Structure 1
């Protein structure tokens, strides 16, 4: 039954991708879509019926060499069960949503066939991520890690006739390989220190790792801190954290349904999953955890500032994903991993709705993506307007200030900000400031596209009409999670320590549980005792951003123009995204090409062959 969830999407993708000419594109679309809904149904049954006893389901031996053995296997615990419903539910809805969104695509002439290929990629992308989350060993985790990398490369560059898509897909693959550089080095170090890659066997030896010095390069390091850092480098790339983020905003070149799947369920969340799955190690690696907090906090602040000035609708949401993952890494860094997954679970709901809602806006507006030509539209697409409004309420953290009554992101974000206050003063202030920016650019998105006067060309505005039911029903389903997910799961994830202990079935060896928290780790308890001003600070930051956005686009709509003139250098800085792409071209891309040419003509040509030909 666990195996069907894992392998049914793979079999459907192979049939749809390779054999649609035999059965037809329409049948191939239903085959993939129907299989995900069956897998999603089984995923929910596994999640709701889980009894807290982790299960191991062998499949096949993968790599066996001397004392090294890694197997194809399924591990089912609380941590996996959470990821099962997230991956299959969002993937299933994207399949259903895609049936209408890709019904007629202008990127392809009538001669070209694309529908069956698109649905085959979605099913395989799902299979890759299901392999990542069910992994019982680090090696199978790497397979799913690289599987989503190649599956994303196929989908970002789906429109292969566009150079921008091909560049973005290539960039995403290469930047993620830089992350897998560190992740591979972590696997090598873990195996030789512990003699295993299996999670349970690793976690048994973690206490001894914290007292072990391992030589790496020019010096000796604490084994736990070094291996924690190396594995996090892999997570930075997959979650598009600072210095490894530039690929995510360029991934918008793919079809909109791909973005909802990449940004909400599969790729970005994998990095957070790895840290939470490896919490037994990080709880014994204090210095690795500190680095995770700084990167998480800085990414949360960085991506929030950049999104303030973006004019493309999908790029505003893309940078919001980078910012939101910054929050999750702060929670994990301070040692509260349930809060990190609580936000991951709620984020999957309302983020997937923001992209699918944005796609509906793009779908209605003749595939225009620039918010400067989206005036009006509140009345022309009512169901898309309310789907996006609920998503904004969730992401901005709308709720009753001092209670536990509010939208999904109200409860999961306030859990992290309280944890940050008890964990890091640096992180706490960067998170509340970033929360203020989150409200501004979220409400800037709503006001620029749904309010004001119809702006831009009038041909698309007059023809704007609501998307078909096949596209709106998935939005409705997600809205159910974007409203009740936070209140439903607040208790099991963050509410009560005893309740959290049994839910995750958590110095003794840190084994047997979905997550581990060290006995000396009390940040979760201190978070509940945070002062009132700390608990309400997210709300005040939210209102401050909302009022600023309202004063900038509804009232006195000339303020955004005047301010940018007053501060032109800073405006260019944010608009150009802090110039990371330009910097990397200067330091990495161009020097690498120059070095290769010099080695080719200087080394092989003039020095080596020059000598051989000389003699």
Structure 2
């Protein structure tokens, strides 16, 4: 009953951000902050009232909250939202990253800031809708709906240093990748709906009805392949990853579009929620290919991140490697590795948010993202290189940060299932330490390699310092006390794992 408002408050807030722009040019940021704080507070209230710690695994479906409303009754399509532990964690993460995105673009006093804030809130509402929708058509609708404001933000509000054509090209590549993969997923959804309609005789796009769908081996594999192609584009899984570094490099320079658009892992959630329960046998036969795609993603992303001369491109390829770890975790059928995947999703969101916000502030300071021009910046800045050192320390899987908890619980469960893939992935963790040290030494240590880095740079403001230190505190608390997060998602992960291993 609060889930429709969880989606609607961002949309109404974006509309009010556009409308209240005429009242003043400093008004839309306040409106976006109020509605993002309201969405975060509603998700936190759902967390407090859900009682997820004392929830046992009763089998799929098991929702802590559920809303249903008829939308297109001809096809049996409904606005069907449902929240449980995993979805709740993703929604709270989306709200926190949305508040961070609003605070990140606070100093934008441009003439059309209301449209920027409307696009931001529409992206955030679409992401929350992806995390909440259990009607398959509604899930696909939110999935493809959140890409239009993403496209326009990248194309029109993006990186000022690049020319217009490069931003248009990056936005077009991102849109083509995501929407073509989404259309393949829509083909799979439609074919599953028609298989169920031939088996029973009724139209349904409901997740719970489509779970009990008898399919032949081979049809189920093809539906699984369509779902996985969509999720692999948005994860990213190699080779469907090329859109991501150009989308990050041409995103708006503050970083809010990286936080709102990319750093929320809807594809790993979709693999856990849909690909594994709807097609458990096909996922069981796809597990070796998906595991080796994850291994290649880890190592390819590490090598790409090391070879970047752009710091934002480096952070994008770090995201590719970490999602390779999560992809290995998802296809393993182990509760421990699934819980590690949840922790890794949250921790990667927090650490990549910190890295991208710090990179945006650094670009504001020195007006270049090329690491061949910045050097020895530890002596020039007051706070930024130390916090960047902390976040690069987190991204290599440092104990005391949640990244270590996620990565190592993934590796423990995966070794219990697949040992060879696990040992190769731990050597991938060595590769992660390599690229993090390389970024740190090329940026902030050594001697100045140009003239802009040779002079004193202004200190970080109280708002930037506050949001970065909040991310630091959250990552440290996740590293040292991950038990509330593990208890929140324990029942949902248990249901998904039991469904996956009881049907194979």
Shared fold by TM > 0.5?
yes
Q: Distance in 1 between the 2:398 and 2:31 partners?
A: 39
1:139 is aligned to 137
2:260 is aligned to 261
Q: Which runs of 5+ in 2 are unaligned?
A: 56-61, 198-203
Does structure 2 retain, via aligned residues, the 8 Å contact 1:159–1:165? no
Aligned ranges 1:165-244 → 2 under 5 Å: 165-195=167-197, 196-203=204-211, 205=212, 209=214, 212-213=215-216, 221-244=217-240
- Residue 15 of structure 1 and its aligned partner are, at CA, apart by 2.1
1:148 is aligned to 146
2:58 is aligned to none
Aligned ranges 1:71-150 → 2 under 5 Å: 71-100=78-107, 102=108, 113-150=111-148
Q: Distance in 2 between the 1:391 and 1:132 partners?
A: 28
Which segment drifts farther, 320-329 or 48-57? Answer: 48-57
Q: Distance in 2 between the 1:444 and 1:463 partners?
A: 23
Q: Distance in 1 between the 2:166 and 2:501 partners?
A: 51
2:471 is aligned to 478
User: Does 1:331 find its partner at 2:338?
Assistant: no
Q: Distance in 2 between the 1:341 and 1:227 partners?
A: 25
Q: Distance in 1 between the 2:497 and 2:148 partners?
A: 29
CA 1:521/1:360 → structure 2, altered by over 3 Å: closer, same or farther? Answer: farther
User: Does 1:299 find its partner at 2:301?
Assistant: no
Q: Which has the larger radius of gyration?
A: 1
Aligned ranges 1:417-436 → 2 under 5 Å: 417-436=411-430
Does structure 2 retain, via aligned residues, the 8 Å contact 1:313–1:358? yes
Q: Distance in 2 between the 1:232 and 1:191 partners?
A: 17
Structure 1-normalised TM-score? 0.73
Does structure 1 retain, via aligned residues, the 8 Å contact 2:392–2:436? yes
Structure 2-normalised TM-score? 0.88
Does structure 1 retain, via aligned residues, the 8 Å contact 2:374–2:450? yes
User: Once the two structures are superposed, what CA deviation does each residue of 1:555-603 show, in whole Å capped at 9, x if it has no partner?
Assistant: xxxxxxxxxxxxxxxxxxxxxxxxxxxxxxxxxxxxxxxxxxxxxxxxx
CA 1:504/1:159 → structure 2, altered by over 3 Å: closer, same or farther? Answer: closer
CA 1:427/1:155 → structure 2, altered by over 3 Å: closer, same or farther? Answer: farther
Does structure 2 retain, via aligned residues, the 8 Å contact 1:364–1:467? no
Does structure 2 retain, via aligned residues, the 8 Å contact 1:263–1:352? no
3-state secondary structure, aligned to 1:372: coil
- Residue 185 of structure 1 and its aligned partner are, at CA, apart by 1.9
- Residue 235 of structure 1 and its aligned partner are, at CA, apart by 0.2
Q: Distance in 2 between the 1:310 and 1:360 partners?
A: 19
User: Does 1:450 find its partner at 2:444?
Assistant: yes
Q: Distance in 2 between the 1:307 and 1:354 partners?
A: 14
Q: Distance in 1 between the 2:458 and 2:485 partners?
A: 42
1:13 is aligned to 14
Does structure 1 retain, via aligned residues, the 8 Å contact 2:398–2:404? yes
Q: Which runs of 5+ in 1 are unaligned?
A: 104-111, 214-220, 400-405, 494-498, 507-512, 523-615
Give the count of matched residue pairs.
476
2:59 is aligned to none
Q: Distance in 1 between the 2:279 and 2:459 partners?
A: 48
CA RMSD in angstroms comes to 2.3
Does structure 2 retain, via aligned residues, the 8 Å contact 1:87–1:130? yes
CA 1:375/1:50 → structure 2, altered by over 3 Å: closer, same or farther? Answer: same
Q: Distance in 2 between the 1:520 and 1:441 partners?
A: 40
